[PDB]
Amino acid sequence: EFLKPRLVDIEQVSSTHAKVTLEPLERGFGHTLGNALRRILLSSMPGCAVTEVEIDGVLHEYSTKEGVQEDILEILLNLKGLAVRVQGKDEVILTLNKSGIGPVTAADITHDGDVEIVKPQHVICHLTDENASISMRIKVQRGRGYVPASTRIHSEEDERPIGRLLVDACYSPVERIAYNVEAARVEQRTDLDKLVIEMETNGTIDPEEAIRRAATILAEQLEAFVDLRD
Amino acid sequence: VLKIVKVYLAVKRRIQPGDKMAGRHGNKGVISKINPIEDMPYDENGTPV
């Protein structure tokens, strides 16, 4: 009859690349599980991302600042890719404060105990003025999917402050998923296959936790079909 | 006329189903719809198109 696939060794190709394997899976179930998990991962994972950036120097997205090789436009574009995970608070306000010439990177942000920057060498900007200071108040919060910064503006009829810049928030920890089903040989019965899922994620989610959350979402969705109300 | 005040307004227009998006060769098109990334096809490595 049935034998449940069991999680086996989760190796780390890199801090962003992980392969999770399910060895004891019956024939005909490999592609089903792989497709379902891939869709859930690219669809329903929670993640931390930036929404509001409050740069002291500039007033709007299209105004440049002194001593930077990058427009505030690219400041927001690079802050979009900020790989960050939060644990206790669903919403946090990171503070970046740096003066002097040099490439201002992600590690330069004042990191709290509830916030971990999994990408420290991520370049934010380049401060080319010997005595200018860059001060950012970056709002990073939890979410799912992709919310363009054009929906919360309708919820309050334009942001009351002017210094806050809205960034389209992509709460997608995973950006690449593939699954391969291979003919496994095991003492368990004679007909089982192994499913290997290779994952490129921003490193802000544990691969085991990602798979567990995906399976939880799949089960909660299948709950309705398991028990038909009518 | 005494004064002339010109105001510049910046709109961040994002691509969406319907915009005329075309290639170099005369290849044309209208954006059909923005299907989720998972719905897009993927190769062996898993890279979506």
Q: DSSP letter string over B1-49?
A: ------------PPP-TT-B---SSS---B------TTTS-B-TT--B-
In the numeric block, which tokens belong to residue A222? 């299948």
Q: Are B45 and A178 in contact (CB under 8 A)?
A: yes
B44, A178: Cβ pair inside 8 Å?
A: yes
Cα distance from A41 to chain B (closest Cα, Å)? 9
Strand pairing class (A17-26; A7-12): antiparallel
Q: Are A111 and A119 in contact (CB under 8 A)?
A: no
B38, A148: Cβ pair inside 8 Å?
A: no
Q: H-helix or E-strand containing A11?
A: strand A7-12
Q: Are A62 and B10 in contact (CB under 8 A)?
A: yes
Q: Which residues contact A31 (CB under 8 A, 6 or more apart)?
A: A179, A181
A61, B12: Cβ pair inside 8 Å?
A: yes
Query: For residue A183, what are the β-bridge partners?
Result: A193
Strand pairing class (A17-26; A192-201): antiparallel
Q: Are A72 and A55 in contact (CB under 8 A)?
A: yes
- The beta-carbon neighbor of B38 closest among A43, A60, A148 is A43
Q: Are A146 and A44 in contact (CB under 8 A)?
A: no
Q: Are A140 and A114 in contact (CB under 8 A)?
A: no
- SS3 call for A42: helix
Which among A185, A196, A171 is positioned nearest to A81, based on CA atoms? A171
A42, B44: Cβ pair inside 8 Å?
A: no
DSSP state of B15: P
Cα distance from B16 to chain A (closest Cα, Å)? 12
For A5, A60, A124, A126, the CA distances from A66, given in Å and listed in that order, are: 58, 14, 15, 11
Chain breaks in chain A following residues, C–N > 2.5 Å: none
Q: Are A163 and A55 in contact (CB under 8 A)?
A: yes
- SS3 call for B13: coil
For A99, A215, A216, the CA distances from A133, given in Å and listed in that order, are: 4, 47, 46
DSSP state of A107: G
The Cα A80–Cα A202 span in angstroms is: 12
The Cα A136–Cα A124 span in angstroms is: 11
| In chain A, residues 55-114 whose CB comes closer than 8 Å to chain B | 60-62
Instruction: Identify residue B8 by its one-letter amino acid code.
Output: Y
Q: Are A175 and A199 in contact (CB under 8 A)?
A: no
Angle formed by the axes of helices A207-226 and A30-43, nearest 10°: 110
The Cα A54–Cα B19 span in angstroms is: 32
In the numeric block, which tokens belong to residue A147? 């919310």
Q: Are A130 and A66 in contact (CB under 8 A)?
A: no
Residue A31 CB-half CA count within 13 A? 2
Q: Spell out where A88-210 has E strands.
A: 91-99, 102-105, 115-117, 123-127, 133-147, 164-166, 169-171, 174-184, 192-201
Q: How many residues does chain A have?
A: 230
Which among A181, A95, A88, A194 is positioned nearest to A142, based on CA atoms? A88
Angle at B40 between CA A154 and CA A10, to 5 degrees: 100
Q: Are B42 and B48 in contact (CB under 8 A)?
A: yes
Which among A184, A223, A220, A181 is positioned nearest to A34, based on CA atoms? A181
Q: What phi, psi does A23 have (nearest 5°)?
A: -80, -55
The rounded Cα A113 to chain-centroid distance in angstroms is: 19
The Cα A95–Cα A140 span in angstroms is: 11
Instruction: Map tokens 């391969």 to a residue.
Output: A180
Residue A173 CB-half CA count within 13 A? 31
* Entry resolution (Å): 3.2
The rounded Cα A3 to chain-centroid distance in angstroms is: 33
Q: H-helix or E-strand containing A51?
A: strand A46-55
Q: Are A121 and A106 in contact (CB under 8 A)?
A: yes
- SS3 call for A192: strand
A42, B38: Cβ pair inside 8 Å?
A: yes
